[PDB]
Amino acid sequence: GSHMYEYPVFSHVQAGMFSPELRTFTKGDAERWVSTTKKASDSAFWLEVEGNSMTTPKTSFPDGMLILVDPEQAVEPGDFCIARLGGDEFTFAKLIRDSGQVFLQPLNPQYPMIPCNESCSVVGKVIASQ
Ligand SMILES: [Ca+2]
Ligand SMILES: [Ca+2]
Ligand SMILES: [Ca+2]
Ligand SMILES: [Ca+2]
């Protein structure tokens, strides 16, 4: 007699003009809720992938896919995550170790890898998709 879960879907828009991979949360409550078997913290939420920066040329997050983000789970190289850059804008990428260096790597080679040091902090771990 297990249980299923449903988390809020949060909206976000392109942060800049020529950087679609950079997002910003929109003002407003959640209007949509998506279910999953994935047990997560009460801070967890979904984000709709909008674009192809995470679409591979076999893990791949095509445009339109929903991803479950849990701010309460620890992230390490190898995990996919949401990272805040600058303090207000965020991006969805794989956290990796490039020759010992920590970078955010989009799955679509067309987008640049970004260092995660000072103006970079992890928002949450991606733990599921729909
Ligand atoms: Ca909590
Ligand atoms: Ca779309
Ligand atoms: Ca570990
Ligand atoms: Ca899935």
Per domain, the residue ranges of the chain are 1-130
Resolution for this experimental structure (Å): 1.8
Cα of 13 from ligand 2 centre, angstroms: 11
Q: Binding site residues, as ranges? A: 42, 50, 63, 72, 76, 129
Ligand nearest to the CA of residue 79, numbered in listed order: 3
61 CB-contact burial (10 Å; exposed 0-12 / middle 13-18 / buried 19+): buried
- How remote is the CA of residue 109 from the centroid of ligand 4, in Å? 23
Nearest alpha-carbon partner for 39 in 74, 70, 80 = 70
Task: Assign domain 1-130 to its CATH architecture.
Answer: Ribbon (2.10)
In angstroms, rounded to a whole number, what is the distance separating the alpha carbons of residues 129 and 122? Answer: 19
Helices (H) and strands (E) in the chain, counts: 0, 11
CB under 8 Å to 19, separation ≥6 — which residues?
A: none
Centroid of ligand 1 to alpha carbon of 71 (angstroms) = 9
Q: How many C-beta atoms surround the C-beta of residue 88 within 10 A?
A: 9
- Would you say 67 and 92 are in contact if contact means Cβ atoms under 8 Å apart? yes
Nearest-angstrom CA–CA distance, 73 and 57 = 29
Around ion ligand 4, residues with a beta carbon closer than 5 Å are 129
User: How many Å lie between the centroid of ligand 3 and the Cα of residue 20?
Assistant: 31
Q: How far is the CA of 7 from the centre of ligand 4 (A)?
A: 14
Cβ 96 vs Cβ 89: under 8 Å: no
